[PDB]
């Protein structure tokens with residue numbers, strides 16, 4: 062996993078990408094296609110482009126570069142933002158409070174119980190399934206941070 | 215994993231939690247402490263509160279319930295946001311484009327090289343280490359979605 066400082070380094074450099082996303086995207090795809098030609102064969106749209114000149118001249122390759130780095134920038138930002146809320150909670154619950162994963166399972170079950178009790182008409186079996194899975198992913202995320210911090214949960 | 219509709223169900227029910235967060239937080243901790251009395255022993259401020267009545271009268275237990283459901287709500291929303299961008303990418307790249315994880319490693323190499331080439335002043339050894347780890351976590355997240363979809367590589 063990344064520290065807070067490491068995430069800030071990632072977001073700082075992504076700021077530079079966004080100032081010329083089209084140029085960054087083009088250079089990334091040309092570097093990829095030239096180093097690993099089998100990757101170009103996956104693009105039915107582009108595999109006819111032989112020369113670096115033809116790749117640089119392609120409107121669509123340049124537009125696709127922008128699509129790729131736009132999507133990746135959004136994933137990295139949303140990852141960083143989830144980390145910024147998960148990390149402090151995992152830190153206190155591992156090091157200060159020392160809360161076992163089983164206790165996190167108990168409060169997860171309590172939350173599902175209370176939502177079923179307060180919203181019986183709305184919180185049906187499907188919605189309950191959704192919340193059960195989301196709280197399991199939450200517990201797994203905490204457990205992975207516990208491990209990194211060397212707390213046996 | 216959760217489907218798109220399942221994530222929306224999680225967000226919808228959290229809106230109902232936030233409409234009476236005091237009541238929800240109280241009832242969650244009461245359900246936890248009454249169902250699993252060993253969990254009360256973790257709370258120096260609360261562990262003397264044995265009955266549901268004593269717990270319901272505690273202004274501090276009610277405030278702590280709100281702190282818990284506020285923290286959890288923020289983490290679920292940030293998780294949903296990351297999933298909303300990761301899921302469609304894993305879906306197309308598994309089912310339509312059929313992109314092996316190794317090819318994601320190749321484009322990750324190209325990204326790091328282009329960032330180092332264009333922005334050496336903002337892409338030192340540490341920052342490069344940070345981006346290498348972030349892109350590996352991205353690949354791992356896609357690989358986990360590939361597995362759910364039963365696509366190997």
Ligand code: HEM
Nearest residue numbers: 100103104106128129132133302303306311313317318321
């Ligand atoms: C950082 C890594 C990557 C990102 C963020 C990314 C993102 C995207 C996005 C947003 C699209 C358009 C929407 C979609 O179909 O899902 C796309 C299309 C596509 N990607 Fe990727 N991609 C990545 C890596 C790769 C790699 C390594 C390959 C192949 C070697 C690949 C092959 C394709 C293909 C063939 C399409 C369809 C393009 C078209 O015909 O217009 N992707 N990608």
Ligand code: HEM
Nearest residue numbers: 149150153154158160164165168253256257281282285286
């Ligand atoms: C959804 C699960 C949980 C969430 C979101 C959560 C969140 C929080 C937050 C935000 C705090 C205050 C800030 C902090 O110290 O990190 C806190 C404190 C605490 N939590 Fe949790 N918590 C959870 C589960 C648990 C469980 C299951 C236990 C024990 C069985 C526990 C025990 C504590 C304790 C002892 C404190 C310190 C209380 C004080 O002295 O004021 N937590 N929790």
Ligand SMILES: [O]
Nearest residue numbers: 125126128129
């Ligand atoms: O792509």
Ligand SMILES: [O]
Nearest residue numbers: 278279281282
């Ligand atoms: O908590």
